[PDB]
């Protein structure tokens, strides 16, 4: 559903430039972006990066709220807690 080539895909911050390598290069490949898709809605992921979320949000279980899609400035978090 809406897996067509997105004409809007560019990392806002330098930190987000690595997201295309982690997810898009494996789970994506289709050519989607921040235009709503099977990932933007959230998921359990398929990489070790899920640990960083599950352990930082203290057991999300269902929805990964307040762990990623809560801060537009990811670089501001990295300069605080690695």
């Amino acid at each position: 559903m809406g897996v067509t080539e997105a004409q809007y895909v560019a990392p806002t911050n330098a930190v987000e430039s690595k997201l295309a390598e982690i997810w898009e290069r494996v789970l994506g490949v289709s050519g989607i972006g921040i235009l709503d898709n099977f990932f933007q809605i959230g998921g359990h992921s398929l990489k070790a990066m899920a640990v960083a979320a599950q352990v930082h949000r203290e057991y999300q279980v269902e929805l990964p709220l307040k762990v990623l899609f809560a801060q537009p400035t990811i670089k501001a978090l990295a300069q605080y807690v690695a």
């Binding site: 560019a10 990392p11 806002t12 911050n13 330098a14 930190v15 430039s17 690595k18 390598e21 982690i22 290069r25 359990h44 992921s45 398929l46 990489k47 070790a48 990066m49 899920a50 640990v51 960083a52 599950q54 352990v55 930082h56 949000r57 203290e58 670089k75 990295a78 300069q79 605080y80 807690v81 690695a82």
Partner: protein, 242 residues
């Protein structure tokens, strides 16, 4: 489709930093390197988002020797150092470690960054529960079952005794009294005791070693106060603040 900024002079010291930030490490390294050396290279990665010409992806090192030394290729830089931030650049790591092993085996200065909090089926008399979580590779949620076998050469697992014994396979039963090269440990956000146990069980301290771990463990997630304090004492470890 990648931006890169470099500035080398007389092949002083090429340092590659994959997207850094303002921290205490810089405030400590800046005065140090400025007093110890000069005319050092300031190679840093730039945030993409729009194609330009080509892409570095660690191959920039070869690009330099291929473009500048187009007349003849003698030998590239030996002490390669890769810096950056914790995340999961397994692709970049794969490129780096691969190029290093195929470029120069007798490496003197190697850095293990973004070390995963999981091991890879190793039996140690560390703890009765050590070998339990060891081969369980979950940490509470790790669906990278298809990547763990790759991470050994694209992430650098904390089990150095298994890494070298998987690549070179020249490791003996005893690994004590081994200290000569340089290797930095940067990662293991959850399992911090693993590098302390296996790292000290051999009682070997190289000529240059550094341990910088983060804090993704539930205790740091709940009590961020501890995480911040750990970072403070980590930055002020080499030099105490006035």
């Amino acid at each position: 489709m990648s931006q890169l900024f470099k500035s080398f002079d007389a092949s002083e010291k090429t340092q590659l930093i994959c997207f850094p930030f303002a921290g205490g490490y810089s405030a400590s390294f800046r005065p140090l390197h400025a007093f110890l050396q000069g005319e050092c290279e300031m190679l840093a990665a730039e945030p993409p988002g729009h194609g330009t010409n080509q892409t570095s992806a660690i191959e920039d090192l070869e690009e330099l020797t291929d473009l500048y030394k187009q007349e003849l290729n003698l030998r590239p830089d030996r002490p390669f150092v890769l810096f950056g931030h914790s995340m999961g650049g397994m692709i970049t790591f794969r490129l780096a470690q691969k190029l290093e092993r195929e470029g120069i085996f007798p490496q003197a200065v190697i850095i293990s960054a973004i070390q995963p909090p999981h091991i890879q089926r190793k039996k140690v008399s560390h703890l009765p529960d050590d070998q339990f979580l060891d081969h369980i590779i979950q940490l509470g949620g790790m669906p990278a079952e298809l990547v763990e076998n790759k991470e050994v050469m694209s992430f650098f697992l904390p089990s150095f005794r298994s890494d070298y014994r998987a690549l070179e396979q020249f490791e003996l039963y005893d690994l004590a009294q081994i200290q000569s090269p340089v290797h930095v440990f940067n990662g293991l956000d959850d399992k911090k005791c693993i590098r302390d146990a296996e790292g000290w069980k051999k009682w070997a301290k190289d000529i240059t070693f550094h341990q910088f771990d983060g804090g993704h463990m539930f205790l740091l997630s709940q009590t961020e106060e501890v995480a911040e304090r750990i970072f403070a004492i980590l930055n002020q470890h080499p030099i105490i603040q006035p």
